[PDB]
Write a protein that binds this ligand. Structure first.
Ligand SMILES: *C(=O)N1C[C@H](NOS(=O)(=O)O)CC[C@H]1C(N)=O
Length: 261
């Protein structure tokens, strides 16, 4: 298709590997480019972890309000919120918000620990019907993004379907789904990625990620003006380990997708 040829041309000009999955829930149509290839999720895996903790809160009514100790040794490579609360506490709701909206890696590690380790996030993924997602490590090593390494990867198709079930479907209870969507809509890191390729009037909730090998990711629920929502996953990774981020490529893929709508 024209969309397929253009995403292939974008990828070719990018010097890396691009994966895109669109679901149009007005009619459930799909656009896929490398939709079944694995990509390192990096920080976009945080969505799953927050959703898994949200799922826990459905049978632990007071869980999201429960204090967690932030200790000096807990800080990792990017802790814009957690570093403010060292030698203090954050609630799991606060940690979820920090992980999703500011991409705080200490907060992500607290979410992971609340689920019993990376395998608890993977187990939640399996429990909501996602067979492809795997989380294997904590922050920051889940971002190594090594080519051919299946750890901490998913496919665009699997992630699009999962994000749809989490934000628009019924993988979560109604309050938890609304809370997840509220968190995603208040993301602070997304304006250069999918959001930039979409018309300004469209509402986006998203989670960005980045890692080694110039890995540049975004996963978004999109509410276009006057139409049913879209789910759009754009993963991008590059051949050299120290490569620079390329959020403009995610914006370009989103712009190509918007024109095909
Ligand atoms: C997630 O990809 N990470 C956590 C934080 N956010 O990246 S984002 O700005 O693309 O969301 C810092 C970078 C990255 C990491 N390497 O930990």
């Amino acid at each position: 298709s024209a969309v397929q040829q253009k995403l292939a041309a974008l990828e070719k000009s990018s010097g890396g590997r691009l994966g895109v999955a669109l679901i149009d829930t007005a009619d459930n149509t799909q656009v896929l480019y490398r939709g079944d290839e694995r990509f390192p999720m990096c920080s976009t895996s945080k969505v799953m972890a927050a959703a898994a903790v949200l799922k826990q809160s459905e049978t632990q009514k007071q869980l999201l309000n429960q204090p967690v100790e932030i200790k000096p040794a807990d800080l990792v490579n990017y802790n814009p919120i957690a570093e403010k609360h060292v030698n203090g506490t954050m609630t799991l709701a606060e940690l979820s918000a920090a992980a999703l909206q500011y991409s705080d890696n200490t907060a992500m590690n607290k979410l992971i620990a609340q689920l019993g380790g990376p395998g608890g996030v993977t187990a939640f993924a399996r429990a909501i019907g996602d067979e492809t997602f795997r989380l294997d490590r904590t922050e920051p090593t889940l971002n190594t993004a090594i080519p051919g390494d299946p750890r901490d990867t998913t496919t665009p198709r699997a992630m699009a379907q999962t994000l749809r079930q989490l934000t628009l479907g019924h993988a979560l209870g109604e309050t938890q789904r609304a809370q997840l969507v509220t968190w995603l809509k208040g993301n602070t890191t997304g304006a250069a990625s999918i959001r930039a390729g979409l018309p300004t009037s469209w509402t986006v909730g998203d989670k960005t990620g980045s890692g080694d090998y110039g890995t540049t990711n975004d996963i978004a629920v999109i509410w276009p003006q006057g139409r049913a929502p879209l789910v759009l996953v754009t993963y991008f990774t590059q051949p050299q380990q120290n490569a620079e981020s390329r959020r403009d490529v995610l914006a370009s893929a989103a712009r190509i997708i918007a024109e095909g709508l």
